[PDB]
Design a protein around this ligand. Structure first.
Ligand code: WCA
Ligand code: WCA
Lengths: 382, 383
């Protein structure tokens, strides 16, 4: 007694974005006009080809042109701008998180009065008390909620929350977990004018804004609840020879991020061990008998892994589709793909929530270099 | 059968560490107003001096020495740019002091670091990518497959926040042994005295010191390889009614600016009885002298008021006030600093238990929210 019986299960997935839709075929011109950098045609040609090959069609952004008119230090590179970003992030991150959590509880079907725990994860902004307290007040959750604040974990937080919510739901009987990952990549936005920092541009051509939420609980009551995926295990590892792959320093100019390693080649040369160690308890070594959710850090990191593993084109269709219509939304991005995996599984009438396959993987890649591999099991679809 | 442990998560080892520079309280009002060049503020000086004399603190260990102040002059300075000047200090020095404590807790543990599966790193000081959980993983030589959890900016209730997280980590994953490190180098507050517009930093600078503590926690301890000390029975977190903005710490280009709106001693007093009633209800315990006490030493008055309202004997907060006396407030690491003290004192005097001769005990983390963390512990037998 006192503790749960079976595995953690995701019971609802809600997504939320801002109203501003920004098409990528226009974003180079916008970005070099707003920044007033029309004279640097070298970086303009470079940033253009970045967005052209990013496979992204549209992205949602809190940062409007008006918000930059009122926060002109964000049209600058290495000028003091931390307060200008935090005056946006501290309020705007819980607000987008409430929208996604409300969509998730709406699918959940049960009142918020029974949410026992809360895990909030963001890389954008930092404050005391954390965005978990802000979301608890904004959503009106029980004041008895016991919260976990994951600050500045990076694009692998989406698997961290699942690996943590499994133990929270399974070690406390009748506990239900509100998981929210809300990221506003206004944490990443500087003036173009820098031949001193070109990785800033492939970061601006890929990231977008959005919030995702799930409800996690063990031993679901199959009258009020509908199971979607059950989290069998969650793993975290440090890739060999990956020291300094991504370095993010939070200074008075915001979070400055610098890359030292070729990340897509690092993920490719090391992912097969992560699939082998995670799928060993089941005896699975064919990665095309598995449904796939991997954080779309970029087009080619999925391209190279898809080539190194010899995967079919269908495996990463949902991943690439979230990168297409939403882009990179950091940690929340993998939960978006979880939702698309379920939505497309019904739209195309496949046997189970994971496009027809029993077992599935959730990959989150971030600083370390760190790979979070989470193995899920599907739910049948009648 | 299943892939999980069968009993409760127990504390297996404890280790603490403090920097070398010792700063005595009977010498702090003068030196502070000299390095900031504020000897023209006789009011704030007498103000600060009475605070230091009423803090019941004797000494504190500090990383920010005067040698460090002359090379970062933005810290002799209130609200001019000072974030990077502390970032250059907190980012490396926080994991270093954490390993200092994790080394001593591993030495007492007696088992190799390869058997440390999970890690929780907790600090309200500084932010970096990758986090301090990565820097300790590399410094301590733990396995690359360690599953880490980063608690950034959790305030002074992190000590109970991590016990609540480490309880589930050790009770779901069978054979798991979770190392938890709370490393607080509270230099984030050293502001220039010149502020008649900010008296709360004074009583934030007359209490807080630096220190780090680390525990090994795991369930089903092998009684032939490990020695249990405390059983983490329950862990709770709650926001007190009518506490909006009690502790507000914003991160600005000039550092972490903390301002107080509500009296947190009277916030803790009027609510501590409800937390203890709810926490000990499954065991029918209502005598708060029947229980051994670990309360976060926010200050002398917060403890004084809890002791007055609940009608406790003076022995209950002896170790809590002793950690406050010789270390000051160290944020989340204090309660674990107190945890080490209770087991030392309880074998100093040959008590019946590891909690001063008591079966059940409580650990309290108070912080921004206002959030109070109530962790019920059970002592283990001592011969
Ligand atoms: C971005 C790539 C390189 C795609 O480009 P490509 O297909 O190999 O070649 P392209 O014709 O498309 O041109 C674009 C790339 O060309 C590369 N390039 C240009 N000059 C040359 C040259 N002389 N020779 C060889 N190649 C060249 C260059 O790598 C540039 O990408 P970037 O590194 O961002 O500048 C590919 O590596 C990729 O998609 N990787 C996955 C993307 C990815 O993981 N992004 C995030 C990395 S880590 C993270 O989470 C955060 C990063 C970030 C960082 C800063 C921020 O402000 C915000 C965020
Ligand atoms: C400070 C108190 C009042 C004990 O002092 P006292 O012995 O009762 O009175 P004193 O004669 O020693 O004078 C000092 C205190 O007296 C109070 N006081 C003074 N002037 C008067 C007056 N005209 N009339 C009535 N009373 C007065 C006043 O509260 C002042 O403290 P402070 O709030 O810092 O200014 C008491 O509030 C106390 O110790 N509480 C526990 C300490 C505590 O919880 N600290 C943490 C709070 S929240 C946190 O985590 C962050 C704090 C922080 C905040 C800012 C930072 O930069 C850094 C950190």
């Amino acid at each position: 007694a006192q503790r749960a019986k079976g595995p953690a299960t995701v019971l609802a997935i809600g997504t939320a974005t801002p109203a501003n839709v920004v098409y990528q075929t226009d974003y180079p011109d916008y970005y070099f006009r707003v920044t007033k950098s029309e004279h640097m045609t070298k970086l303009k040609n470079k940033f253009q080809r970045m967005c052209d090959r990013s496979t992204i069609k549209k992205r949602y952004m809190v940062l409007t042109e008006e918000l930059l008119e009122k926060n002109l230090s964000l049209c600058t590179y290495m000028e003091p701008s931390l307060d200008a970003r935090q005056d946006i992030l501290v309020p705007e991150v819980p607000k987008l998180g409430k929208e996604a959590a409300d969509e998730a509880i709406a699918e959940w079907g049960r009142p918020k009065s029974e949410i026992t725990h809360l895990i909030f994860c963001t890389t954008c902004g930092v404050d005391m008390p954390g965005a978990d307290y802000q979301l608890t007040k904004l959503l009106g959750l029980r004041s008895s909620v016991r919260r976990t604040m994951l600050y500045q974990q990076g694009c692998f937080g989406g698997g961290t929350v699942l690996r943590l919510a499994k133990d929270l739901a399974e070690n406390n009987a009748g506990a239900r977990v509100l998981v929210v990952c809300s990221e506003i990549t206004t944490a990443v936005n500087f003036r173009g004018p820098s031949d001193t920092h070109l990785d800033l541009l492939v970061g601006l051509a890929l990231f977008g804004d959005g919030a995702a939420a799930v409800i996690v609980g063990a031993d679901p009551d199959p009258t009020l609840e509908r199971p979607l995926f059950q989290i069998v295990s969650g793993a975290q590892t440090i890739l060999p020879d990956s020291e300094g792959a991504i370095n993010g320093h939070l200074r008075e100019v915001g979070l400055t991020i610098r890359l030292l390693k070729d990340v897509p080649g690092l993920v490719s040369m090391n992912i097969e061990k992560c699939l082998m160690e995670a799928f060993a308890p089941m005896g699975i070594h064919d990665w095309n008998s598995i449904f796939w959710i991997a954080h779309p850090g970029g087009p080619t990191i999925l391209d190279q892994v898809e080539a190194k593993l010899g995967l079919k084109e269908e495996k990463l269709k949902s991943t690439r589709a979230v990168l297409r219509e939403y882009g990179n939304m950091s940690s929340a991005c993998v939960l978006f793909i979880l939702d698309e995996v379920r939505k497309r599984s019904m739209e195309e009438g496949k046997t189970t929530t994971g496009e027809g396959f029993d077992w599935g993987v959730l990959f989150g890649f971030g600083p370390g270099f760190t790979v979070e591999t989470v193995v899920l099991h599907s739910m049948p679809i009648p």
